[PDB]
Amino acid sequence: AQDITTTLLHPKGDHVLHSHAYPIFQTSTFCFDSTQQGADLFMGKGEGHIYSRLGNPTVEQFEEMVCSIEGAAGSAAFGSGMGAISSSTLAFLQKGDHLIAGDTLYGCTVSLFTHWLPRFGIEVDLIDTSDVEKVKAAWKPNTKMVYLESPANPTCKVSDIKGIAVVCHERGARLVVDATFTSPCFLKPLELGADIALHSVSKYINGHGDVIGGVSSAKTAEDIATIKFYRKDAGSLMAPMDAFLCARGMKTLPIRMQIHMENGLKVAKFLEQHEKIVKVNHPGLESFPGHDIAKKQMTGYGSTFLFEMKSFEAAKKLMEHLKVCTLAVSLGCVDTLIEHPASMTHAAVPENIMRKQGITPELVRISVGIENVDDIIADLKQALEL
Amino acid sequence: AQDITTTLLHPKGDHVLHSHAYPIFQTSTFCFDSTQQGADLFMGKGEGHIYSRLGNPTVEQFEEMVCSIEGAAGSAAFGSGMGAISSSTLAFLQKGDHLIAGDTLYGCTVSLFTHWLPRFGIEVDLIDTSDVEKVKAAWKPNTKMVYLESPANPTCKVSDIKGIAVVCHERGARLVVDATFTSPCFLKPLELGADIALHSVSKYINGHGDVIGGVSSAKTAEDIATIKFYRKDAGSLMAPMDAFLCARGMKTLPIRMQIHMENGLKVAKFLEQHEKIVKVNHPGLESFPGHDIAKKQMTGYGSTFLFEMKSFEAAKKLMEHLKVCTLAVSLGCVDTLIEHPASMTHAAVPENIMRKQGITPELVRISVGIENVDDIIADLKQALELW
Amino acid sequence: AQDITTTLLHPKGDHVLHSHAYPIFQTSTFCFDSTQQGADLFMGKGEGHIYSRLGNPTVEQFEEMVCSIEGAAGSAAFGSGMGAISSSTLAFLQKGDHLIAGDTLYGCTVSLFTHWLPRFGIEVDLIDTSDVEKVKAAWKPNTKMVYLESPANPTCKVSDIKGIAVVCHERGARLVVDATFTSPCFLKPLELGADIALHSVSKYINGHGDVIGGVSSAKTAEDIATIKFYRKDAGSLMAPMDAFLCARGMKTLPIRMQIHMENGLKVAKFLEQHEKIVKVNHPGLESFPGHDIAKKQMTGYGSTFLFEMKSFEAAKKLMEHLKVCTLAVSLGCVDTLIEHPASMTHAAVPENIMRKQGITPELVRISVGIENVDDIIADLKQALELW
Amino acid sequence: DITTTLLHPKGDHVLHSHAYPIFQTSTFCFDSTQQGADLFMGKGEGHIYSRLGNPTVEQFEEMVCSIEGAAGSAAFGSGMGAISSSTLAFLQKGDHLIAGDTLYGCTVSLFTHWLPRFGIEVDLIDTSDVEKVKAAWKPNTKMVYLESPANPTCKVSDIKGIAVVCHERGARLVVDATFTSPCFLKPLELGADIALHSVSKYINGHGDVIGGVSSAKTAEDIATIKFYRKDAGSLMAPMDAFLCARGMKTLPIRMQIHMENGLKVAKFLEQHEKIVKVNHPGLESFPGHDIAKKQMTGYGSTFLFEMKSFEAAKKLMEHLKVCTLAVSLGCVDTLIEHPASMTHAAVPENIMRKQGITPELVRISVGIENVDDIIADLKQALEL
């Protein structure tokens, strides 16, 4: 079977005007041959384009790429991971429905589920999804969806996607998984029985820290059609230039991910054995709870994770004396990023959810890039002594 | 008072590295100087950026330009007009609230209001907003918003923005106006009593047919903050390259709108006097109902409007034999576009709403560009006079 | 005949995948159907592309637009005006050949002609081309080219393009004309007898101050092929993104030029009557030498020109106290620029050429944009009236 | 290693932006007349006009400069811009140039058509032999220009040995290292004066930009190159510089894969019955392997092999399902072409025999796809 590297470098589709690189269709609208041809396209008859919000060829080329790696029925690209998340949940959930979500989620995902969904009459329970029994107990007659992040941002908490997918299939709910932290090279939720797999493309998939985007991929034709129907009216679109840059970034995704993985594990083991570090939450470490689940259900690991210092002062000292690592939010870029979740990425999480997430001022989140690991380790080593 | 032409060419703000054009910040994140500086920006203390979804300098430059012409407290840019429309309605409306909206709206706006809003427990009525008495009769104790498009896409139906705004103001409802069809050069809903003014920037503001985007501007700091809070979580963003292009397109907005307006009126008059043409729905014509309101409440007219042929077959023969006009949907581009609403832009509108909207197979919509008007008229004339 | 506004908005060519805007072909190479199809394209047989340096579809689109306004056999786009100038001169001149060029030329053109051409065994005289008799007197048996800028940058000195072309045609010399300062809306050198017309597209053609580029257009198929042969090996290319932006800027070129022309004449007239201003060098003024030639050979004027203050100190005081005008080099942008030739654009021109050129510390060059003209005049007036 | 350096270039962030912004501008504003006057005289820090200097372009120049160990680098609108700028910035009427006899097609066009019109004497000679360089030497020889391994035959020149001759005799050595990338070949480190690349190939690597770069050992030489550029006008667009800097972030990792893939493919081809001979500089069989191994730290993945006939070549080139028939090289995906009727079709008949280019030769540029997939594509097209 042809390798993913080869697949991403040779996507399906004809060349445009014999061009080797796929052109950037920086256009709003498309021309019709005749009234009938235009009318037919609006009814979904024949092949062609109408208007970029409905479909843009450069964006569609990127969608096909992601669809190929996910093994999906189709994919939809968005202006951001939040666009993909909004569009993969609110396209399905309506007043009177109930959502079960992980209690440790990306910051704006918490804002979405906690502030906006309940204004739309949607009941939401944030619960510890690392325990399938806790999902079963939280179930109600109107439960229509389970939403998971595994490993969770930022603590890397691992959930049993496969076992939860079984409960979802049995009980008639959709399973939506945000695989942003791991990339589709290593985590393919649709293979584990999820209905929807989504990513902040802003992170690993693009990988170059120069685009914000989102993608969502559905197991069924009907579901991706619904997501794109929601997208048409909600309006979170990937720009043609950004789609050009995301497809270009994804051409190196497999090699980048192999390096990220190996680099991140090397850094996590260095940190785990260092006298100043209390613990390291990398799902690929033997000591991490749910390592057994993450090794069985994934084929590799992302390189973003958190570790615990002895005090806030210690963390501040480390974060502020690094020469190679950059103090910034976001993750999955080619270069190494570091941040303080308590006062940056997860500062807006309500205090009750803060507690349940286990985030404290002593935690530091690092996103290991594709630099020579020895440079990242020497940078950290450098800083840790002072 | 400085002319808008000058204002748009001289936006406030320092240059970046002395660059004359404002740079394209094609970046996802921003660097912090220290833990405290980062922590503070997250609390909204100090000046600086964090992450492009929360704020991107190139996008913010474009927002300030729109804010300047609307006379707003702030503006928010989006990945599309639909992003602006969603974010300007659903950032405020919640389960149990009631919305009154016009019965003749842009198709995807109907789709949003009739399919998605009710799934969120929001009650919606589509009402003929050209009659303020019908707006009042549809009012309920839980009415929280009125949403208007005037002149309406595609029929150019005019609503009394100023009169409806009085009722909104007396009763605690927000008034939202989509002014896409006219541009902020000629219609400034915030001067007429609206709380929010929005546009599909995809149309006139950008003007060059090469970007999809949206913008919404609010009369108060609180309302623009809420819109941007919704945007953070809903995720309809204008990309940095698109913002660079929209700001660039907007540098010629005032002169383009002048030419559009004058061309559009001349093409409407030509059509109104032509034997093949039954009726012309351009709000600048004296024959048009509500011309008196449009003339009082706007300082000019867009150049997109609809006209009635004697038959579907006559409309098709006209649309398919033009050499200057391009058969395509969308509007507000420098070049002239033409389409058939009944089978194209409005073919997705439920027929209960299509009959009330007044859309029939005899209607053709044209979006007059900035070509020499005599060449546009000669194109139309040669097709209308075909064997 | 169809208006140039309309022509530029409707360039010849098929749409690509029905796209309304012409796509950006951000590609280095193109795929071949077969060995034969590739071999044929290399032999110039059949239709298609090979590699962006030889030809890029987005760049070709922009070349077609310029070719249509110049009335040329073909046009070639470059990475800069200087790429165009180098490629329109060195594609033809060889060791032992002689060039006559104007004595008042854009600074880097002076650099090219005085530093690089002589190194290649090409003989160069810089001559006052406002006098045909001086051109004739400088002619030699080996004269192969005359190169003119009219009106000259920055003094606006006018040369008789038509009269000099007669001499070139009689004696077998190519006439090359840099029409940057005027734009092809108002100066069409190929109609006046030139063999090659070129521009810095960085200035008016693009108009938006965000691209550096050049274009050259030839009267004959042979000459444009020779220019592109030189380009292939010298390598000054317009990038696909830049070509997209240039074609986009050019969609508004005719209306921009109308406003530039009118604004520039009104600013020159205001300056001419102002007590602080010694002289105004705008070729549209009746007081200007060679106004008569410029009015017969052009159909309008650019809006970049020079004026004389009473002292260097007065020039600095004016330049540093403007709120609309921006202190910067370059010209032909939608917004108004101002600079000091003696210490900036023309500070590298060898001293003997500086006195021949007439550039002194009292001179200020203004490039009038498309802002409201009363706002520009009021900005100048308040600075001139300072304490 | 090299990856860390490319990911952490020197300079301040602009407005705290993590990615370096795209300065899509033609001009820059001045704070005062004095500040503008000073900048024109080279006094103070700042920018004037994008042709003289653009911040996004400069960031890409600094990246390449860092890897070449140069005094400075200049970016261009194409490889040809870098080439014409690194030769004609120095050579003048009456000077003599010695160039390798096998070069990129357009380089042959530049040297044989344009340079002699400018009164510059040019001899193309076999630079794989240092003695032949010494024998072609004249009192007015001012430059040797090399491409090693050469395009398309991979013919290898002794850069180090020729540099010694050049230093001794007062000539500049200019080296086009396009085929190898600055990860593996650093001509300034072998004694060359100027090292240049078509950035369109490996450095960008993503098949979506045309661009050039030239790096000089001395501050004076890069100043001269940029002075020529100011007037000749081959510039890198700010968007292209943004794309080139971005591509270069994966350059070291892409090169490792290209190198390994290229060698595996060469070896497969070398033992295949259908293949007469493989010209890859990393093979034991190739003439000048010993020099390329001493003078380079790796190899590019573009190389040539010989089929038994034209018909056999046409058959192979037209039945590939993964490899794309196209000119150019050094892209992330595999390209294949026929030099005799494509890249090198315009080379003067005299020079092409001297190059040994025949209808039986095919050139492949091996991408970063899984090698087994590339090999299986070649296998089916050779055997079916």
PDB file of N, CA and C in Angstrom, chain B residues 259-317:
ATOM      1  N   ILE B 259     -18.683  56.127  -9.464  1.00  0.00           N
ATOM      2  CA  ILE B 259     -18.876  55.588 -10.808  1.00  0.00           C
ATOM      3  C   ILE B 259     -19.995  54.510 -10.843  1.00  0.00           C
ATOM      4  N   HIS B 260     -19.974  53.558  -9.903  1.00  0.00           N
ATOM      5  CA  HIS B 260     -21.073  52.584  -9.797  1.00  0.00           C
ATOM      6  C   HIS B 260     -22.423  53.334  -9.749  1.00  0.00           C
ATOM      7  N   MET B 261     -22.526  54.290  -8.828  1.00  0.00           N
ATOM      8  CA  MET B 261     -23.825  54.929  -8.649  1.00  0.00           C
ATOM      9  C   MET B 261     -24.292  55.559  -9.962  1.00  0.00           C
ATOM     10  N   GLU B 262     -23.399  56.283 -10.618  1.00  0.00           N
ATOM     11  CA  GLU B 262     -23.799  57.042 -11.817  1.00  0.00           C
ATOM     12  C   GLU B 262     -24.086  56.039 -12.964  1.00  0.00           C
ATOM     13  N   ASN B 263     -23.221  55.035 -13.110  1.00  0.00           N
ATOM     14  CA  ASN B 263     -23.432  54.031 -14.155  1.00  0.00           C
ATOM     15  C   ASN B 263     -24.754  53.340 -13.922  1.00  0.00           C
ATOM     16  N   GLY B 264     -24.983  52.909 -12.679  1.00  0.00           N
ATOM     17  CA  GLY B 264     -26.193  52.161 -12.354  1.00  0.00           C
ATOM     18  C   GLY B 264     -27.469  52.911 -12.688  1.00  0.00           C
ATOM     19  N   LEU B 265     -27.495  54.209 -12.406  1.00  0.00           N
ATOM     20  CA  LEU B 265     -28.666  55.016 -12.659  1.00  0.00           C
ATOM     21  C   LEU B 265     -28.870  55.166 -14.158  1.00  0.00           C
ATOM     22  N   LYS B 266     -27.783  55.349 -14.902  1.00  0.00           N
ATOM     23  CA  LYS B 266     -27.922  55.483 -16.348  1.00  0.00           C
ATOM     24  C   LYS B 266     -28.396  54.180 -17.020  1.00  0.00           C
ATOM     25  N   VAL B 267     -27.903  53.047 -16.527  1.00  0.00           N
ATOM     26  CA  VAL B 267     -28.325  51.760 -17.085  1.00  0.00           C
ATOM     27  C   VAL B 267     -29.793  51.513 -16.751  1.00  0.00           C
ATOM     28  N   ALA B 268     -30.207  51.825 -15.519  1.00  0.00           N
ATOM     29  CA  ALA B 268     -31.640  51.724 -15.133  1.00  0.00           C
ATOM     30  C   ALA B 268     -32.551  52.583 -16.003  1.00  0.00           C
ATOM     31  N   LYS B 269     -32.125  53.810 -16.302  1.00  0.00           N
ATOM     32  CA  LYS B 269     -32.958  54.675 -17.159  1.00  0.00           C
ATOM     33  C   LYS B 269     -33.067  54.157 -18.579  1.00  0.00           C
ATOM     34  N   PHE B 270     -31.937  53.726 -19.139  1.00  0.00           N
ATOM     35  CA  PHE B 270     -31.924  53.064 -20.451  1.00  0.00           C
ATOM     36  C   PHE B 270     -32.913  51.893 -20.483  1.00  0.00           C
ATOM     37  N   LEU B 271     -32.821  51.015 -19.490  1.00  0.00           N
ATOM     38  CA  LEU B 271     -33.700  49.859 -19.410  1.00  0.00           C
ATOM     39  C   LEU B 271     -35.165  50.280 -19.215  1.00  0.00           C
ATOM     40  N   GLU B 272     -35.401  51.282 -18.364  1.00  0.00           N
ATOM     41  CA  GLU B 272     -36.777  51.676 -18.073  1.00  0.00           C
ATOM     42  C   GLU B 272     -37.490  52.173 -19.327  1.00  0.00           C
ATOM     43  N   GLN B 273     -36.753  52.815 -20.243  1.00  0.00           N
ATOM     44  CA  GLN B 273     -37.343  53.290 -21.496  1.00  0.00           C
ATOM     45  C   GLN B 273     -37.347  52.242 -22.636  1.00  0.00           C
ATOM     46  N   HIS B 274     -36.737  51.085 -22.417  1.00  0.00           N
ATOM     47  CA  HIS B 274     -36.671  50.082 -23.486  1.00  0.00           C
ATOM     48  C   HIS B 274     -37.963  49.233 -23.629  1.00  0.00           C
ATOM     49  N   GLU B 275     -38.430  49.078 -24.864  1.00  0.00           N
ATOM     50  CA  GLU B 275     -39.657  48.301 -25.191  1.00  0.00           C
ATOM     51  C   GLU B 275     -39.671  46.860 -24.620  1.00  0.00           C
ATOM     52  N   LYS B 276     -38.511  46.212 -24.533  1.00  0.00           N
ATOM     53  CA  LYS B 276     -38.447  44.830 -24.030  1.00  0.00           C
ATOM     54  C   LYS B 276     -38.618  44.750 -22.519  1.00  0.00           C
ATOM     55  N   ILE B 277     -38.461  45.888 -21.826  1.00  0.00           N
ATOM     56  CA  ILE B 277     -38.384  45.872 -20.364  1.00  0.00           C
ATOM     57  C   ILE B 277     -39.718  46.268 -19.747  1.00  0.00           C
ATOM     58  N   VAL B 278     -40.237  45.430 -18.863  1.00  0.00           N
ATOM     59  CA  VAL B 278     -41.559  45.667 -18.273  1.00  0.00           C
ATOM     60  C   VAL B 278     -41.471  46.656 -17.118  1.00  0.00           C
ATOM     61  N   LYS B 279     -40.469  46.475 -16.253  1.00  0.00           N
ATOM     62  CA  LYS B 279     -40.316  47.283 -15.030  1.00  0.00           C
ATOM     63  C   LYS B 279     -38.848  47.272 -14.631  1.00  0.00           C
ATOM     64  N   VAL B 280     -38.388  48.340 -13.966  1.00  0.00           N
ATOM     65  CA  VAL B 280     -37.027  48.410 -13.450  1.00  0.00           C
ATOM     66  C   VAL B 280     -37.123  48.758 -11.953  1.00  0.00           C
ATOM     67  N   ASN B 281     -36.547  47.909 -11.105  1.00  0.00           N
ATOM     68  CA  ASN B 281     -36.546  48.097  -9.648  1.00  0.00           C
ATOM     69  C   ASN B 281     -35.217  48.669  -9.160  1.00  0.00           C
ATOM     70  N   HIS B 282     -34.954  49.924  -9.470  1.00  0.00           N
ATOM     71  CA  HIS B 282     -33.773  50.629  -8.966  1.00  0.00           C
ATOM     72  C   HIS B 282     -34.310  51.705  -8.015  1.00  0.00           C
ATOM     73  N   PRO B 283     -33.818  51.746  -6.756  1.00  0.00           N
ATOM     74  CA  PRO B 283     -34.421  52.644  -5.751  1.00  0.00           C
ATOM     75  C   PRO B 283     -34.173  54.140  -6.010  1.00  0.00           C
ATOM     76  N   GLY B 284     -33.253  54.456  -6.933  1.00  0.00           N
ATOM     77  CA  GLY B 284     -33.034  55.854  -7.378  1.00  0.00           C
ATOM     78  C   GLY B 284     -33.977  56.359  -8.459  1.00  0.00           C
ATOM     79  N   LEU B 285     -34.828  55.490  -9.000  1.00  0.00           N
ATOM     80  CA  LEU B 285     -35.848  55.928  -9.983  1.00  0.00           C
ATOM     81  C   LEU B 285     -37.075  56.533  -9.310  1.00  0.00           C
ATOM     82  N   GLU B 286     -37.624  57.610  -9.874  1.00  0.00           N
ATOM     83  CA  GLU B 286     -38.824  58.204  -9.308  1.00  0.00           C
ATOM     84  C   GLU B 286     -40.013  57.226  -9.330  1.00  0.00           C
ATOM     85  N   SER B 287     -40.017  56.306 -10.293  1.00  0.00           N
ATOM     86  CA  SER B 287     -41.109  55.349 -10.432  1.00  0.00           C
ATOM     87  C   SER B 287     -41.076  54.288  -9.324  1.00  0.00           C
ATOM     88  N   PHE B 288     -39.976  54.174  -8.578  1.00  0.00           N
ATOM     89  CA  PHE B 288     -39.856  53.073  -7.605  1.00  0.00           C
ATOM     90  C   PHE B 288     -40.536  53.357  -6.250  1.00  0.00           C
ATOM     91  N   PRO B 289     -41.359  52.415  -5.736  1.00  0.00           N
ATOM     92  CA  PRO B 289     -41.996  52.667  -4.437  1.00  0.00           C
ATOM     93  C   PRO B 289     -40.927  52.732  -3.336  1.00  0.00           C
ATOM     94  N   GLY B 290     -41.019  53.742  -2.482  1.00  0.00           N
ATOM     95  CA  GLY B 290     -39.994  53.940  -1.449  1.00  0.00           C
ATOM     96  C   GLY B 290     -38.727  54.653  -1.923  1.00  0.00           C
ATOM     97  N   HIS B 291     -38.715  55.120  -3.176  1.00  0.00           N
ATOM     98  CA  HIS B 291     -37.688  56.052  -3.617  1.00  0.00           C
ATOM     99  C   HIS B 291     -37.593  57.235  -2.658  1.00  0.00           C
ATOM    100  N   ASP B 292     -38.732  57.711  -2.151  1.00  0.00           N
ATOM    101  CA  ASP B 292     -38.690  58.880  -1.260  1.00  0.00           C
ATOM    102  C   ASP B 292     -37.904  58.570   0.046  1.00  0.00           C
ATOM    103  N   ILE B 293     -38.115  57.383   0.609  1.00  0.00           N
ATOM    104  CA  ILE B 293     -37.382  56.982   1.824  1.00  0.00           C
ATOM    105  C   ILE B 293     -35.899  56.790   1.504  1.00  0.00           C
ATOM    106  N   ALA B 294     -35.578  56.084   0.414  1.00  0.00           N
ATOM    107  CA  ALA B 294     -34.166  55.805   0.053  1.00  0.00           C
ATOM    108  C   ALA B 294     -33.389  57.115  -0.168  1.00  0.00           C
ATOM    109  N   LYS B 295     -34.048  58.067  -0.818  1.00  0.00           N
ATOM    110  CA  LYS B 295     -33.440  59.368  -1.104  1.00  0.00           C
ATOM    111  C   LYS B 295     -33.150  60.191   0.180  1.00  0.00           C
ATOM    112  N   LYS B 296     -34.029  60.092   1.185  1.00  0.00           N
ATOM    113  CA  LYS B 296     -33.864  60.794   2.448  1.00  0.00           C
ATOM    114  C   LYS B 296     -32.821  60.107   3.330  1.00  0.00           C
ATOM    115  N   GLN B 297     -32.803  58.779   3.346  1.00  0.00           N
ATOM    116  CA  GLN B 297     -32.002  58.067   4.342  1.00  0.00           C
ATOM    117  C   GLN B 297     -30.615  57.635   3.863  1.00  0.00           C
ATOM    118  N   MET B 298     -30.384  57.729   2.555  1.00  0.00           N
ATOM    119  CA  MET B 298     -29.074  57.388   1.945  1.00  0.00           C
ATOM    120  C   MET B 298     -28.516  58.591   1.199  1.00  0.00           C
ATOM    121  N   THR B 299     -27.212  58.622   0.984  1.00  0.00           N
ATOM    122  CA  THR B 299     -26.628  59.753   0.252  1.00  0.00           C
ATOM    123  C   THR B 299     -26.209  59.346  -1.164  1.00  0.00           C
ATOM    124  N   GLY B 300     -26.646  58.154  -1.583  1.00  0.00           N
ATOM    125  CA  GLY B 300     -26.436  57.696  -2.942  1.00  0.00           C
ATOM    126  C   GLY B 300     -27.050  56.322  -3.076  1.00  0.00           C
ATOM    127  N   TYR B 301     -26.706  55.595  -4.145  1.00  0.00           N
ATOM    128  CA  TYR B 301     -27.303  54.268  -4.404  1.00  0.00           C
ATOM    129  C   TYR B 301     -26.213  53.330  -4.896  1.00  0.00           C
ATOM    130  N   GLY B 302     -26.270  52.068  -4.470  1.00  0.00           N
ATOM    131  CA  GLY B 302     -25.511  51.001  -5.135  1.00  0.00           C
ATOM    132  C   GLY B 302     -25.962  50.822  -6.586  1.00  0.00           C
ATOM    133  N   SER B 303     -25.309  49.917  -7.310  1.00  0.00           N
ATOM    134  CA  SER B 303     -25.587  49.781  -8.730  1.00  0.00           C
ATOM    135  C   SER B 303     -26.068  48.388  -9.070  1.00  0.00           C
ATOM    136  N   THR B 304     -26.573  47.674  -8.058  1.00  0.00           N
ATOM    137  CA  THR B 304     -27.158  46.338  -8.260  1.00  0.00           C
ATOM    138  C   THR B 304     -28.649  46.449  -8.133  1.00  0.00           C
ATOM    139  N   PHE B 305     -29.361  45.935  -9.128  1.00  0.00           N
ATOM    140  CA  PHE B 305     -30.807  46.075  -9.131  1.00  0.00           C
ATOM    141  C   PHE B 305     -31.405  45.077 -10.098  1.00  0.00           C
ATOM    142  N   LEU B 306     -32.708  44.977 -10.078  1.00  0.00           N
ATOM    143  CA  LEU B 306     -33.365  43.943 -10.804  1.00  0.00           C
ATOM    144  C   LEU B 306     -34.309  44.592 -11.857  1.00  0.00           C
ATOM    145  N   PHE B 307     -34.594  43.888 -12.951  1.00  0.00           N
ATOM    146  CA  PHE B 307     -35.586  44.365 -13.920  1.00  0.00           C
ATOM    147  C   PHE B 307     -36.394  43.194 -14.439  1.00  0.00           C
ATOM    148  N   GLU B 308     -37.573  43.493 -14.952  1.00  0.00           N
ATOM    149  CA  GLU B 308     -38.502  42.470 -15.400  1.00  0.00           C
ATOM    150  C   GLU B 308     -38.566  42.403 -16.944  1.00  0.00           C
ATOM    151  N   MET B 309     -38.300  41.217 -17.499  1.00  0.00           N
ATOM    152  CA  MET B 309     -38.447  40.957 -18.927  1.00  0.00           C
ATOM    153  C   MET B 309     -39.895  40.467 -19.170  1.00  0.00           C
ATOM    154  N   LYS B 310     -40.282  40.315 -20.438  1.00  0.00           N
ATOM    155  CA  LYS B 310     -41.636  39.832 -20.762  1.00  0.00           C
ATOM    156  C   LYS B 310     -41.835  38.328 -20.556  1.00  0.00           C
ATOM    157  N   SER B 311     -40.739  37.582 -20.428  1.00  0.00           N
ATOM    158  CA  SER B 311     -40.814  36.147 -20.269  1.00  0.00           C
ATOM    159  C   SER B 311     -39.492  35.596 -19.763  1.00  0.00           C
ATOM    160  N   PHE B 312     -39.554  34.382 -19.251  1.00  0.00           N
ATOM    161  CA  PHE B 312     -38.332  33.650 -18.898  1.00  0.00           C
ATOM    162  C   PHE B 312     -37.422  33.498 -20.126  1.00  0.00           C
ATOM    163  N   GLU B 313     -38.011  33.133 -21.258  1.00  0.00           N
ATOM    164  CA  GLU B 313     -37.224  32.966 -22.490  1.00  0.00           C
ATOM    165  C   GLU B 313     -36.514  34.254 -22.915  1.00  0.00           C
ATOM    166  N   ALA B 314     -37.200  35.397 -22.806  1.00  0.00           N
ATOM    167  CA  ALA B 314     -36.565  36.689 -23.111  1.00  0.00           C
ATOM    168  C   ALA B 314     -35.409  36.981 -22.144  1.00  0.00           C
ATOM    169  N   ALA B 315     -35.595  36.702 -20.856  1.00  0.00           N
ATOM    170  CA  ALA B 315     -34.537  36.884 -19.861  1.00  0.00           C
ATOM    171  C   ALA B 315     -33.320  36.004 -20.218  1.00  0.00           C
ATOM    172  N   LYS B 316     -33.554  34.751 -20.572  1.00  0.00           N
ATOM    173  CA  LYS B 316     -32.450  33.846 -20.890  1.00  0.00           C
ATOM    174  C   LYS B 316     -31.710  34.319 -22.143  1.00  0.00           C
ATOM    175  N   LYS B 317     -32.448  34.752 -23.163  1.00  0.00           N
ATOM    176  CA  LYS B 317     -31.835  35.233 -24.393  1.00  0.00           C
ATOM    177  C   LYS B 317     -30.993  36.495 -24.134  1.00  0.00           C
TER     178      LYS B 317
END
